[PDB]
Amino acid sequence: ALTNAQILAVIDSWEETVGQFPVITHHVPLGGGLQGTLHCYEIPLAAPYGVGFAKNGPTRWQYKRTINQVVHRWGSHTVPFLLEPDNINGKTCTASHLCHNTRCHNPLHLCWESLDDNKGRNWCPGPNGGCVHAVVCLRQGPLYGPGATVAGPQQRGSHFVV
Amino acid sequence: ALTNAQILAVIDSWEETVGQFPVITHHVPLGGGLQGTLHCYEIPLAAPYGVGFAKNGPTRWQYKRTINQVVHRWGSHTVPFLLEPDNINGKTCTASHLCHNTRCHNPLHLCWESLDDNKGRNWCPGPNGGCVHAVVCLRQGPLYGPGATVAGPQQRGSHFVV
DNA sequence: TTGACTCTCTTAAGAGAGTCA
DNA sequence: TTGACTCTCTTAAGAGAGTCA
Ligand SMILES: [Zn+2]
Ligand SMILES: [Zn+2]
Ligand SMILES: [Zn+2]
Ligand SMILES: [Zn+2]
């Protein structure tokens, strides 16, 4: 695609195909001891994946369409954001899974932000636990918690001070 | 080296020279709108760095010691935890800078944990902002905040639901 | 034009080891 | 022995591009 109208058509056909991906219901923590429900449209574990889809990595996929004899390829989860800026504050925009399910391509579960913002959601308390993200989280964050630290700050002598 | 007494000796000489690195005071956000003061023992920007230290990368250093005519080498931030398990639940233990200051080698600003627990501290609200890390954070975390999302969850048609 | 594979690269939090003097 | 450089690798969040029928 090249014109905004052609990109819209690419987005429409992508939504049409992903819409038919198996929809899986997941019960997730929202923070604050609350539990929620998220519906993920998951790409198959193996070929075929869907019209226009091909796997380029263990958990990486691409969407391809041939408009006017020329082939076009986009990362699997980047299609919904084809009409938005591709960088912000000098950082590349990436498809961030609000649901934290890589195979999911439900666009209602993705946002477009920098890699740092993207990664950080892994540790967010959730929409019901104190999330402060402007584009709010859909669920807690798989890594949120006390952690499992093996050894904390310590010294054998007295050469240091906090 | 190999023995417990030889390892302690390594931790002791390491602390001694690091205990001589220039001490820089850093005022940091603690969360909850409070501010704290950290004392980082920062390795010099260029050689010489200190007895046993050598720079292997822009912000990477290694500590070296000749024990029984045979030279031993460790990542400069790992020495304090030479006696602790090197993995947890199958994950490599990592030297986590509680002060988010790479050049700092103050053991009172370091903890031993998985890379995931390590990274997650970049987004922690802080000791006074809601930090729930078992081994408490020393400061908020450089990346905590609303983020700068360019586009949130959206769909053009009606094939999806949250 | 398409599907199903192949390949290496980006970011930052971290690592290992080799070459010289 | 100790110092000062060189190189590539690891892990998860995420990418682009080539081959072949
Ligand atoms: Zn999802
Ligand atoms: Zn959040
Ligand atoms: Zn420090
Ligand atoms: Zn914390």
DSSP track, B9-65: HHHHHHHHHHTTSPEEEEEEEEETTEEEEEEEEBPPSSS---TTEEEEETTEEEEEE
Cis geometry, peptide bond prior to residue A153 (ω within 30 degrees of 0):
no
Examine the residue annotation and report whether B104 is marked as an active-site residue of this protein: yes
Measured in whole angstroms, how far is the alpha carbon of residue A16 from the centre of its chain? 19
Yes or no: say if B130 and A130 are a contact pair by the CB < 8 Å rule. yes
CA-wise closest residue to A14 among A61, A69, A66, A52: A52
Residue nearest to nucleotide D17 (CA to C1'): A73
Strand B23-31 versus strand B53-57 pairing type: unpaired
d(CA B130, CA A30): 16
d(CA A56, CA A27): 29
Q: Which domains does chain B have, with CATH numbers?
A: 1-162 (3.90.75.10)
Q: Would you state the structure tokens that stand for residue B157, as one six-digit string?
A: 């048609």
Give the three-class secondary structure for B160.
Answer: coil
d(CA A55, CA A63): 9
CA distances from A88 to A84, A107, A117, B144 (A): 11, 20, 11, 17
d(CA A160, CA B1): 24
Q: Would you state the structure tokens that stand for residue A16, as one six-digit string?
A: 């049409």
Write the single-letter amino acid at B134.
A
Write the single-letter amino acid at B155.
Q
- Across the A/B interface, how many CB contacts are shorter than 8 Å? 182
CA-wise closest residue to B156 among A101, A96, A9, A43: A9
d(CA A31, CA A135): 16
Catalytic residues of A: 60, 97, 104, 118
d(CA B15, CA A155): 8
Report the gap between the CA of A152 and the closest CA in chain B (Å): 4
The answer for residues whose C-beta is within 8 angstroms of residue B12's C-beta and 6 or more apart is: A156, A157
Yes or no: say if B14 and B63 are a contact pair by the CB < 8 Å rule. yes
* Length of chain A (residues): 162
CB-CB under 8 Å, B125 with A123: no
- DSSP structure class, residue A122: G
Q: Classify residue B134 as left (phi > 0), alpha (psi -120 to 50) or beta.
A: alpha
Write the single-letter amino acid at A80.
P
CA-wise closest residue to A11 among A99, A141, A149, A105: A105
Q: Find the angle CA(A28)-CA(B140)-CA(B106) to the nearest 5 degrees.
A: 120
Yes or no: say if A162 and A153 are a contact pair by the CB < 8 Å rule. yes
Q: Would you state the structure tokens that stand for residue A131, as one six-digit string?
A: 């999330």
Resolution (A): 2.2
B48 CA → D4 C1’, Å: 9
Structure obtained using: X-ray
Identify any residues that bridge with A23 across adjacent strands, giving them in sequence order.
A41
Q: Write down the residue that tokens 């009172």 correspond to.
A: B108
Q: Within 10 A of A146 (CB to CB), how many other CB atoms are there? A: 12
Element (H or E) spanning A55, and its range? Answer: strand A53-57
Of all nucleotides in the shown strands, which has a C1' nearest the CA of A100? D13
Is the Cβ of A117 closer than 8 Å to some Cβ of chain B?
yes
CB-CB under 8 Å, B113 with A149: yes
Q: Would you state the structure tokens that stand for residue B12, as one six-digit string?
A: 């002791």
Residue nearest to nucleotide D2 (CA to C1'): B52
The answer for residues whose C-beta is within 8 angstroms of residue B94's C-beta and 6 or more apart is: B112, B113, B114, B115, B118
CB-CB under 8 Å, A152 with B111: yes
Write the single-letter amino acid at A8.
L
CA-wise closest residue to B77 among B98, A35, B87, A121: B98
